[PDB]
């Protein structure tokens, strides 16, 4: 059973695909978001993404369809590699740590309108060992996913 805070966080994530704020992800919004993140999605690959999550035949994913997607069961092994896959999406320069610049790169692709101060406070709060970057452990930790690391 998800708290309001966990639903809210999913919703804020939903909001980054739904740029026109219609309350749905269309196929063209999905395509723009996947390219930006560096996956090279194909027109037909997008049709399958859309069809598999939209359960009411609208051709769009609303927050409730997205919310099933983002709360479906997953084993611990699958979930670890999930966090890991996401950490490596950031690590662009393959250095083993998430730097200010990684984050700035990723916030921009998702269309976050963040200042450097706001990015630095995001770096600052995860850091922990005071090195100015975010390693694997402290990544797991700020995601509130400690027992997986």
């Amino acid at each position: 059973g998800l708290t309001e805070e966990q639903k809210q966080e999913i919703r804020e994530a939903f909001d980054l695909f739904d740029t026109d704020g219609s309350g749905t992800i269309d196929a063209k919004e999905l395509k723009v978001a996947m390219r930006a993140l560096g996956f090279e999605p194909k027109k037909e690959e997008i049709k399958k993404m859309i069809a598999d999550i939209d359960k009411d035949g609208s051709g769009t994913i609303d927050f409730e369809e997205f919310l099933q997607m983002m709360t479906a069961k997953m084993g611990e092994r699958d979930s670890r590699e999930e966090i890991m896959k996401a950490f490596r999406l950031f690590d662009d320069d393959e250095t083993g740590k998430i730097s200010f610049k990684n984050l700035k790169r990723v916030a921009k692709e998702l269309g976050e309108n963040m200042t450097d101060e706001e990015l630095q406070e995001m770096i600052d709060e995860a850091d922990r060992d005071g090195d100015g970057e975010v390693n694997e452990e402290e990544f797991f930790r700020i995601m509130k996913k400690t027992s997986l690391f």
Binding site: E9, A33, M34, K42, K48, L89, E118, M122, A126, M143
Partner: peptide
Amino acid sequence: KRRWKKNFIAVSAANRFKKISS
């Protein structure tokens, strides 16, 4: 806090959609 997790959930979603395609 929420910013970190928000990014996580968006990038996790990207990763799920990619998984669906293949």
